[PDB]
Design an enzyme around this catalytic site. Sequence first.
Site, PDB file in Angstrom:
ATOM      1  N   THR A  63       1.734  -2.656   7.558  1.00 45.61           N
ATOM      2  CA  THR A  63       0.832  -2.781   6.410  1.00 45.61           C
ATOM      3  C   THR A  63       1.275  -3.892   5.455  1.00 45.61           C
ATOM      4  O   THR A  63       0.651  -4.120   4.411  1.00 45.61           O
ATOM      5  CB  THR A  63       0.671  -1.445   5.664  1.00 45.61           C
ATOM      6  OG1 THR A  63       1.955  -1.013   5.197  1.00 45.61           O
ATOM      7  CG2 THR A  63       0.095  -0.384   6.599  1.00 45.61           C
ATOM      8  N   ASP A  77      -0.028   0.669   0.428  1.00 45.80           N
ATOM      9  CA  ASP A  77       1.098   0.921   1.338  1.00 45.80           C
ATOM     10  C   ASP A  77       1.602   2.339   1.194  1.00 45.80           C
ATOM     11  O   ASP A  77       1.922   2.993   2.180  1.00 45.80           O
ATOM     12  CB  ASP A  77       2.248  -0.035   1.064  1.00 45.80           C
ATOM     13  CG  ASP A  77       1.883  -1.445   1.363  1.00 45.80           C
ATOM     14  OD1 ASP A  77       2.128  -1.899   2.508  1.00 45.80           O
ATOM     15  OD2 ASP A  77       1.308  -2.089   0.467  1.00 45.80           O
ATOM     16  N   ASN A 130      -1.476 -10.931   3.934  1.00 48.74           N
ATOM     17  CA  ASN A 130      -0.370 -10.500   4.787  1.00 48.74           C
ATOM     18  C   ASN A 130       0.022 -11.559   5.810  1.00 48.74           C
ATOM     19  O   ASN A 130       1.213 -11.767   6.061  1.00 48.74           O
ATOM     20  CB  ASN A 130      -0.690  -9.175   5.486  1.00 48.74           C
ATOM     21  CG  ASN A 130      -0.623  -7.988   4.534  1.00 48.74           C
ATOM     22  OD1 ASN A 130      -0.167  -8.128   3.406  1.00 48.74           O
ATOM     23  ND2 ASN A 130      -1.087  -6.816   4.985  1.00 48.74           N
ATOM     24  N   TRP A 180       0.892  -8.780  -8.904  1.00 59.13           N
ATOM     25  CA  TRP A 180       0.619  -7.782  -7.878  1.00 59.13           C
ATOM     26  C   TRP A 180       1.886  -7.100  -7.401  1.00 59.13           C
ATOM     27  O   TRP A 180       1.863  -5.934  -7.026  1.00 59.13           O
ATOM     28  CB  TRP A 180      -0.063  -8.422  -6.672  1.00 59.13           C
ATOM     29  CG  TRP A 180      -1.414  -9.028  -6.906  1.00 59.13           C
ATOM     30  CD1 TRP A 180      -2.178  -8.979  -8.047  1.00 59.13           C
ATOM     31  CD2 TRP A 180      -2.178  -9.743  -5.941  1.00 59.13           C
ATOM     32  NE1 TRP A 180      -3.367  -9.655  -7.847  1.00 59.13           N
ATOM     33  CE2 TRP A 180      -3.391 -10.126  -6.559  1.00 59.13           C
ATOM     34  CE3 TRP A 180      -1.950 -10.110  -4.609  1.00 59.13           C
ATOM     35  CZ2 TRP A 180      -4.370 -10.859  -5.885  1.00 59.13           C
ATOM     36  CZ3 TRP A 180      -2.929 -10.829  -3.942  1.00 59.13           C
ATOM     37  CH2 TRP A 180      -4.118 -11.199  -4.582  1.00 59.13           C
ATOM     38  N   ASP A 203       4.986  -3.194   2.760  1.00 59.75           N
ATOM     39  CA  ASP A 203       5.483  -4.036   1.677  1.00 59.75           C
ATOM     40  C   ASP A 203       5.184  -3.496   0.274  1.00 59.75           C
ATOM     41  O   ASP A 203       4.997  -4.255  -0.673  1.00 59.75           O
ATOM     42  CB  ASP A 203       5.004  -5.485   1.835  1.00 59.75           C
ATOM     43  CG  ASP A 203       3.503  -5.648   1.642  1.00 59.75           C
ATOM     44  OD1 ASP A 203       2.719  -4.677   1.816  1.00 59.75           O
ATOM     45  OD2 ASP A 203       3.099  -6.790   1.342  1.00 59.75           O
ATOM     46  N   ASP A 260      -4.582  -0.786   3.809  1.00 64.33           N
ATOM     47  CA  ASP A 260      -3.473  -0.167   4.538  1.00 64.33           C
ATOM     48  C   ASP A 260      -3.722   1.292   4.875  1.00 64.33           C
ATOM     49  O   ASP A 260      -3.208   1.799   5.872  1.00 64.33           O
ATOM     50  CB  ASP A 260      -2.178  -0.283   3.731  1.00 64.33           C
ATOM     51  CG  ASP A 260      -1.835  -1.719   3.393  1.00 64.33           C
ATOM     52  OD1 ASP A 260      -2.462  -2.634   3.975  1.00 64.33           O
ATOM     53  OD2 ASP A 260      -0.962  -1.930   2.527  1.00 64.33           O
TER      54      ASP A 260
HETATM   55  O1  LIG Z   1      -4.421  -8.508   1.775  1.00 66.43           O
HETATM   56  C1  LIG Z   1      -4.362  -7.079   1.722  1.00 66.43           C
HETATM   57  C2  LIG Z   1      -2.913  -6.602   1.514  1.00 66.43           C
HETATM   58  C3  LIG Z   1      -2.834  -5.090   1.835  1.00 66.43           C
HETATM   59  O2  LIG Z   1      -1.781  -4.812   2.773  1.00 66.43           O
HETATM   60  C4  LIG Z   1      -2.593  -4.377   0.481  1.00 66.43           C
HETATM   61  O3  LIG Z   1      -1.273  -3.827   0.361  1.00 66.43           O
HETATM   62  C5  LIG Z   1      -2.786  -5.437  -0.613  1.00 66.43           C
HETATM   63  N1  LIG Z   1      -2.455  -6.659   0.106  1.00 66.43           N
HETATM   64  C6  LIG Z   1      -2.529  -7.942  -0.661  1.00 66.43           C
HETATM   65  C7  LIG Z   1      -3.637  -8.017  -1.731  1.00 66.43           C
HETATM   66  C8  LIG Z   1      -4.807  -8.704  -1.386  1.00 66.43           C
HETATM   67  C9  LIG Z   1      -5.862  -8.820  -2.290  1.00 66.43           C
HETATM   68  C10 LIG Z   1      -5.757  -8.264  -3.561  1.00 66.43           C
HETATM   69  C11 LIG Z   1      -4.587  -7.590  -3.923  1.00 66.43           C
HETATM   70  C12 LIG Z   1      -4.465  -7.029  -5.191  1.00 66.43           C
HETATM   71  C13 LIG Z   1      -3.300  -6.357  -5.538  1.00 66.43           C
HETATM   72  C14 LIG Z   1      -2.274  -6.266  -4.598  1.00 66.43           C
HETATM   73  N2  LIG Z   1      -2.411  -6.811  -3.399  1.00 66.43           N
HETATM   74  C15 LIG Z   1      -3.532  -7.468  -3.020  1.00 66.43           C
HETATM   75 CA   LIG Z   2       0.536  -3.884   2.052  1.00 63.81          CA
END
Ligand SMILES: OC[C@@H]1[C@@H](O)[C@@H](O)CN1Cc1cccc2cccnc12
Ligand SMILES: [Ca+2]
Lengths: 324, 322
Positions: free
Chosen positions: A136, A14, A185, A82, A9, A258
């Site tokens: 991922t 990723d 996720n 994000w 994603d 990931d």
């Molecule tokens: O929860 C972890 C997932 C992973 O697959 C990774 O791509 C980021 N993602 C979500 C995520 C969780 C926690 C903080 C973040 C900060 C920025 C972006 N994504 C985040």
């Molecule tokens: Ca991801």
Amino acid sequence: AKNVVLDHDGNLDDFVAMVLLASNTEKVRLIGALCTDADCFVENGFNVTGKIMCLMHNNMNLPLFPIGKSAATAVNPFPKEWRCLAKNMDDMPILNIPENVELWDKIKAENEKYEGQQLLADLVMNSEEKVTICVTGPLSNVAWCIDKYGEKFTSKVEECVIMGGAVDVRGNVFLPSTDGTAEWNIYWDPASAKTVFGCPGLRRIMFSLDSTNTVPVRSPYVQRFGEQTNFLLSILVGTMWAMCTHCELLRDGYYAWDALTAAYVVDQKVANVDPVPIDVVVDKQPNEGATVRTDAENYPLTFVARNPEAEFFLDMLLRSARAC
Amino acid sequence: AKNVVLDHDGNLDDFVAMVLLASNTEKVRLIGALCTDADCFVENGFNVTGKIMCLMHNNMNLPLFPIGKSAATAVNPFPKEWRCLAKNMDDMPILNIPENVELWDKIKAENEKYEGQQLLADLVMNSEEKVTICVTGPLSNVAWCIDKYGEKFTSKVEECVIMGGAVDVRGNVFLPSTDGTAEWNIYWDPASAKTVFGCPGLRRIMFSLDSTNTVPVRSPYVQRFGEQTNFLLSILVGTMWAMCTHCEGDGYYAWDALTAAYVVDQKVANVDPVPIDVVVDKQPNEGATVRTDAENYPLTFVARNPEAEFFLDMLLRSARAC
Ligand SMILES: OC[C@@H]1[C@@H](O)[C@@H](O)CN1Cc1cccc2cccnc12
Ligand SMILES: [Ca+2]
Ligand SMILES: OC[C@@H]1[C@@H](O)[C@@H](O)CN1Cc1cccc2cccnc12
Ligand SMILES: [Ca+2]
């Protein structure tokens, strides 16, 4: 080399996962990728996937592969802040070398016609040998394939290596309405996750926060890619990681979530696994999206990663980023 | 070349500004830099300044110069998310090449020792020729020098070229307690800004939002640095701008880069004289730059109608210096 599909994603890790998988051609034949509109805007995530593939194709022995945009829609969307990170990457000098973007412009029309979920089903089912799916992002696409094809799909999967969930640690979904037990996720699409984790004929390896918490993205490691600027992949991976290091002013944090998951696909020495029956909370409760242990009879097992070989992983990434 | 000091606060455009000043050695002799704990964490901003200087020293023979951290504290601090951008730069591969990091580590202690505000005073007052101060963060440091040294300081300043304020357009400070007419650099320390804008015997050029609004950072132009990946500065500038293209009052502009471009070549913009006062009271327009009617009030030359194509070409060309 074994056949691998990357179901991602489009956030920064990723793309680090993509580099790890693509660069390790002795171990991994990357036969396709799909991007989900979860932790990115899918147009950007798709474009960055193609731009990375073309950079690598032009500089090392990486055969082109199909890339599809998933039609999956969010149950609970990611924070907009994000999701913007793929947009930033789309504009990076390292991904916009004219010879590489010329190649991408040329092959884009073929790729933007793919539907990602159908692409995942087709790559898995029409492969001669079994296919490992490195997931991922959210589990929407694997669940779609399960719902549509069942055992015709699952019998062709070597294993699903999934970044998701949190079993014996806190989650990372901290919202006014949540209790912090869920990981993002899974939370994006709990129902799809429930389909995957409860599927009887599917082998699952799960990198939950239990293992990924051990590998935060930290400045001294990231700065090591600075030792390797003659390598395009080190400019690429180092740049992405540099945007993920802990800013001293902040007091959520970034991990190699990931990337660790992909590293396991490259070499299983990355982590040991524990058999656990994993169910998913799908109800609109504070713990929506939680991955929980279940003692229900005949419930399928998932192999949850534990005690990852952090130094081994960190060395693997640094070496992989010297492929070109 | 004319003597220039960069007085900056370590956001991405502050660093693009530094690259513009440093790369244009025919026009600009960069004799020092100061970093302020405003739109960055000062330690990060400090390290990035050093790391850029050292890369440029090793690759284009840029003379080394003192870099000081300012002890200035916020009246109204920046949002923490925005302040974290220099951390990202500190960890960028392009800024962490062994030969450049090794040089920085060698000279860091000398630079750590300076008190930034005193450094600005000394660089200006001890220079044989007059010094242009390019101010791309809050005005706290120029005000501190004015307060301590007065005419003994200002008489040695060629001119101040300042990024800040908003004159005939809205500002960019949008808070529950504000009316949106103030710009952030002034808002961070209104009293210091008032001191600077009201100071007699000091030539001021002002890049307010009126002019900087003309140069939003957009993807097509940013991607053009991809054409120049053989140049370290194009990897550097392109990378910084690429981190800005998503922004969405949160919109990112080439604010400080346009300001520095003017220092390089005044054809970047024409200017109009305006008597500028600053609202310092705790009212909704706290930090606003307004026209004052005060008799014999000193003028500030506010930039108008910038030459955008000229600026854009200048930056692409400057990023080919090494
Ligand atoms: O929860 C972890 C997932 C992973 O697959 C990774 O791509 C980021 N993602 C979500 C995520 C969780 C926690 C903080 C973040 C900060 C920025 C972006 N994504 C985040
Ligand atoms: Ca991801
Ligand atoms: O108000 C513009 C000043 C400039 O000096 C530039 O360095 C950024 N800075 C503050 C600022 C204003 C508006 C939006 C922003 C977004 C991110 C960071 N800083 C911002
Ligand atoms: Ca600034």
